[PDB]
């Protein structure tokens, strides 16, 4: 058996989705699936490693963001003979999670449940890809979040929010790289046609939402289009994504 | 009592200041301070507690707030055998706090520290306070937060923000409960002469501070009376109390 620590709730989920979770000894903060990672200790985060936290649940490798950080902390657990792997997690694009699908499948001695995995995938988004070319026009879509105490901001181009809203059929009408705050006249002005935002923000009422710049006058709001995603799943692109790809999809052409 | 899991952030400050923070084991994701804490294992939100990910941990007791997580999983911690002991949060008052501080120091057999505690709290308030008897006018603040994935909201009576504005010589002009999210109508109409918001939300630059409803148009903004406070000091009330009151105060009346 091979004892994993594992920082990116996106690579845990990649990682048991490949039947590899059994050798999973450990996880950081941005880890909340699958349900039995419960048990599992929970140390520090992805972009804030704890060395000592780590090497205290005795690893055999440590898999994680090649962005992942302080690099001292990688430097430590290499010094410490610990296998650390790394993947990259920019961009946000399919080919680029199958690479790592695979890379990953490969260092854990897995490639069938890994070529399974992304397979299984690119089916089911393929169905709804075959299903959007019918329709004629791309919904314009935006996608507003709050992460780290954040201000509320749009999600632009690059993001995985934005691949997310491409492979449902939507047309993202952000038009800058990355997240950015928007002032109440750029969002009325972006005039998109629905507006997704996490059901962590609208927890159990829409008027929530009032505190966010012009959010209140533009057509979607208006016109009742505001559609709630789970923030866990347009964070990182998982094994899920294609089930939130399907559930936005649907949403975005109801009936 | 040997072996703690502590869940409520402000409360393993309290427990560390007091000299028990060998005896912690495992911490909750409000949890951030001190730094020696990053090396353990946190479980979920207070308030949505998993029997599993506290149990894993071999805990004696359990020290977190009267109205945390889920009563199912508490019952199921009583199950085990394991100590529970809860505080009162809701009252965001000094009174509350120092109650809390005795009752801490009584279960963990350390009350001098207790006492010890209370007594340089208390001193350097005071003296905040006889320093805003010598002020000269009075100030009108508003303190707006951004809590998990949710929208910008106004921190209202009753909470911990507003708890420390008035400590720190401020009128709150939020009359409200606890926290609710403001239209820009309702923000301009608050009319607040300063605005206090998180560190987090500026990082950065406060041109990320666009996307909150009605800020550009308050005086606060206009006049440049924008005040950051790093969020893990105003959400709860620890033995940084005072530095945090001091420093704002300090920053509501300049040099």
Known sequence: AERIVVAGGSLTELIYAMGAGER??????????????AKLPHIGYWKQLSSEGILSLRPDSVITWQDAGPQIVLDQLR????N???????????????ANIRQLAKTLQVPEQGDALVTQINQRLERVQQNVAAKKAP???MFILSAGGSAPQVA????????????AGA????????????????????????????????????NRLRSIAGITHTAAWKNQRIIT???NLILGMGPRIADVVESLHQQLWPQ
Chains 1, 2 share one sequence.
Do not use: F
């Not at 010094?79 to 610990?82: I, L, S």
């Not at 632009?156 to 492979?167: E, M, N, P, Y």
């Open 139 to 141: 919904v314009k879509a």
């Open 229 to 231: 995603v789970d923030q």
């Open 156 to 167: 632009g181009k690059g993001s995985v929010a934005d691949a997310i809203l491409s492979l």
């Open 24 to 37: 999973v000894v450990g996880v950081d903060e941005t880890t909340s699936y699958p349900p039995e990672t």
């Open 79 to 82: 010094a410490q003979k610990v």
């Open 84 to 98: 650390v792997v790394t993947l990259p997690r920019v961009p946000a694009t399919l080919e680029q999670m199958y």
């Open 171 to 206: 047309e993202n009408v952000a038009t800058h790289q990355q997240y950015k705050s928007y002032s109440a006249e750029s969002l009325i002005a972006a005039n998109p046609e629905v507006i997704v935002v996490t059901s962590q923000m609208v927890d159990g009422d829409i």
